[PDB]
C-alpha cells in the first residue's frame, strides 16, 4: 500500500499504480471500509451521472500524462483507498487494479468520548456469566484506552478490549469486555470503566447497589 495524506479545502491528485502502455482506458475506483466500491473515472476522463465535478481524471492526449485523478476542494470525507484500473492497448486484460493508495484527510476538530457502562442483565446474571461492557463513541482522533477498576484498583484479569474503529461520522468507537463471573462483578463496591481520550477521561462507574 502507498500512504498519502492531503489537507482540507486543498486540491489532491492521485497517480495510477501502473503506467500507461498504448492508448488507455483508465478505470479509477474508490473503496471505503465495510462499504461497496464506486466507479469515478472510466474511459480515462469520463464521469457518470451523480458524481461530483471536483473529480477529474487524466484524458487521453496520446500518452504523455500518466493516469492521475484530480480532486479539487479536498474534504474530511475523502479518506479511502484508491485503485486505478489501467485498461490499455498493450497490457491487455488487466486482472488487477494496481496498488492501493489509502488517503487520510487530516485537519479535523476534536470531540469528546461518549462513554457508558452497563451492569450484567437480569437474565444474564441467571446464566452464570457476567461481562462488563464499556462502550465509547464520538471521539476524534481514535486514541482511547479502556481500563477496568475493581473499587479503586486496576483489573487486568480477563480484559477483552476491542480496537477503536471509525464510525460513519468520521469518529471512532470502541467496546471492551471484562471477562468475569456474576460473583466478581458483585464483589466490589463500585466497578469503574476508565476511558481516557486526549488526556481527559470519561469514566462511567456502575455500582450494584444503585437501581
Amino acid at each position: 500500500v502507498r500512504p498519502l495524506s492531503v489537507a482540507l479545502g486543498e486540491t489532491a491528485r492521485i497517480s495510477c499504480g501502473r503506467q500507461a502502455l498504448g492508448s488507455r482506458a483508465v478505470q479509477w475506483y474508490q473503496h471505503r471500509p465495510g462499504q461497496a466500491p464506486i466507479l469515478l473515472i472510466y474511459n480515462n476522463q469520463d464521469r457518470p451521472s451523480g458524481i461530483p465535478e471536483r473529480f477529474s481524471g487524466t484524458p487521453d492526449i496520446n500518452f504523455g500524462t500518466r493516469a492521475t485523478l484530480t480532486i479539487s476542494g479536498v474534504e474530511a470525507g475523502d479518506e479511502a483507498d484508491y485503485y486505478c484500473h489501467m485498461w490499455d492497448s498493450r497490457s491487455g486484460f488487466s486482472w488487477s487494479f494496481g496498488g492501493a493508495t489509502r488517503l487520510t484527510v487530516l485537519g479535523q476538530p476534536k470531540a469528546a468520548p461518549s462513554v457508558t457502562l452497563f451492569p450484567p442483565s437480569s437474565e444474564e446474571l441467571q446464566a452464570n456469566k457476567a461481562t462488563l461492557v464499556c462502550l465509547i463513541s464520538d471521539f476524534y482522533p481514535g486514541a482511547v484506552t479502556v481500563a477496568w477498576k475493581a473499587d479503586s484498583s486496576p483489573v487486568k484479569a480477563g480484559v477483552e478490549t476491542t480496537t477503536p474503529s471509525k464510525q460513519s461520522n468520521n469518529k471512532y468507537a470502541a467496546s471492551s469486555y471484562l471477562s468475569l463471573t456474576p460473583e466478581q462483578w458483585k464483589s466490589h463496591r463500585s466497578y469503574s470503566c476508565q476511558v481516557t481520550h486526549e488526556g481527559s477521561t470519561v469514566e462511567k462507574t456502575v455500582a450494584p447497589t444503585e437501581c
Binding site: G22, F63, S89, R90, G92, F93
Partner: protein, 314 residues
C-alpha cells in the same frame, strides 16, 4: 543466429515483429556486444528451448545498409540530349504510343520525372488528357504489359502508424548499424487510404474507354493478382525512408458489364531489399524514427490479361 520472440501483445492474433537478442561485435575488435532489436518477419527466417532465427539474405548475397544520410526520396529528373541530337515530345492528346505521332515538338530536356521506385502503381508522374489513354505495344499478346495514363490524379495517404525508435549500435570504427527500437505506445500497422467514390467513377470512365477497343457491350471483371515475388504480388515503394509492401485485393473486387466513404489497404515494411534482383549484393534500409506519412498522387498503371478461357465471354 538470432534469438527472437513473438512481440509483446495481448493474444487476439490468429506477431510478425520479433524481440531479437543476439551476440554482436563492437568497435574494439576483442570485446563483443549483446543487443536486442525488433525486426519484421520478412527480413529473417528460422533455423532448426526457444526457436532461433537468422537473416534471409545470409545464404544469398552480401548485405549492405544505405547510410541514413542518403535518402530514397524520388527527385524529379529531366533527361537531356547533347548537340547534334535532340529530344522529341509527342503532344497529341489521344496517342497510343505506337505508329506515327501527329503532334511533334522538339525539346532538349524532358519534364520533371521522379525516378519513382515502385511496383503495381505509379505515383507523382504525368497525367493524360481528355479520355484516359490506353497504350500497349501489342494488345493481342496477353504477356506484353499494358500501360494506362490518367486524366484525373488520385489521392492516397500512406502511413506507418507505429512510432519507431532507431538504435544506432557501433560496429566501427567508422562503421555502425541503425537498428529498430521498441514501438512507443499503441501497436498499429501500416496502411493507405483511397477514396471509394472517385474510385468507382474511375472504373466507370475506364470501362467506357475499353469498350472502344474491346466490344461495344461486354463484361469486364477485376480480380487480385496471381503469384510471384513479394515485390510483384504486392505494391513496393519507398515512403520517406522505408519500403512499404501492401495488400491490393478489395480494389479489384468487381464485375462490370455495360450500363459515402473510402477504402483502406493493409501494408508491410521490409528493410533488407535486393531490388532489381541482382544477387551477390543486397541492401538494408535503416528504420525511420516514428510515424511515417507520405501522400502520393497516382498517375499511371500497369496490367496484364488472362487467357482463352471461354470464347467471347469475359
Amino acid at each position: 543466429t538470432l534469438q527472437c520472440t513473438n512481440v509483446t501483445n495481448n493474444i487476439t492474433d490468429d506477431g510478425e515483429l520479433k524481440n531479437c537478442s543476439f551476440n554482436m561485435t563492437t568497435e574494439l575488435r576483442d570485446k563483443k556486444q549483446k543487443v536486442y532489436s525488433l525486426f519484421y518477419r520478412l527480413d529473417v527466417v528460422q533455423i532448426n528451448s526457444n526457436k532461433e532465427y537468422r537473416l534471409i539474405n545470409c545464404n544469398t548475397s552480401a548485405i549492405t545498409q544505405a547510410c541514413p544520410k542518403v535518402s530514397f526520396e524520388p527527385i524529379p529528373i529531366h533527361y537531356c540530349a547533347p548537340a547534334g541530337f535532340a529530344i522529341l515530345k509527342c503532344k497529341d492528346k489521344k496517342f497510343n504510343g505506337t505508329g506515327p505521332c501527329p503532334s511533334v515538338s522538339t525539346v532538349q530536356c524532358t519534364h520533371g520525372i521522379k525516378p519513382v521506385v515502385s511496383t503495381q502503381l505509379l505515383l507523382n508522374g504525368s497525367l493524360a488528357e481528355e479520355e484516359v489513354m490506353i497504350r500497349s505495344e501489342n494488345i493481342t499478346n496477353n504477356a506484353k504489359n499494358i500501360l494506362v495514363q490518367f486524366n484525373t490524379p488520385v489521392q492516397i495517404n500512406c502511413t506507418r502508424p507505429n512510432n519507431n525508435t532507431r538504435k544506432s549500435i557501433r560496429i566501427g570504427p567508422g562503421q555502425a548499424f541503425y537498428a529498430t527500437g521498441d514501438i512507443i505506445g499503441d501497436i498499429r500497422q501500416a496502411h493507405c487510404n483511397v477514396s471509394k467514390a472517385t474510385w468507382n467513377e474511375t472504373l466507370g470512365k475506364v470501362v467506357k474507354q475499353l469498350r472502344k477497343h474491346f466490344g461495344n457491350n461486354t463484361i469486364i471483371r477485376f480480380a487480385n493478382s496471381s503469384g510471384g515475388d513479394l515485390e510483384v504480388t504486392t505494391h513496393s515503394f519507398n515512403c520517406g525512408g522505408e519500403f512499404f509492401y501492401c495488400n491490393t485485393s478489395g480494389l479489384f473486387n468487381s464485375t462490370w458489364i455495360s450500363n459515402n466513404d473510402s477504402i483502406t489497404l493493409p501494408c508491410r515494411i521490409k528493410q533488407i531489399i535486393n531490388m532489381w534482383q541482382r544477387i551477390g549484393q543486397a541492401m538494408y534500409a535503416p528504420p525511420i524514427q516514428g510515424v511515417i506519412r507520405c501522400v502520393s498522387n497516382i498517375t499511371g498503371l500497369i496490367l496484364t490479361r488472362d487467357g482463352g478461357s471461354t470464347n467471347s465471354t469475359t
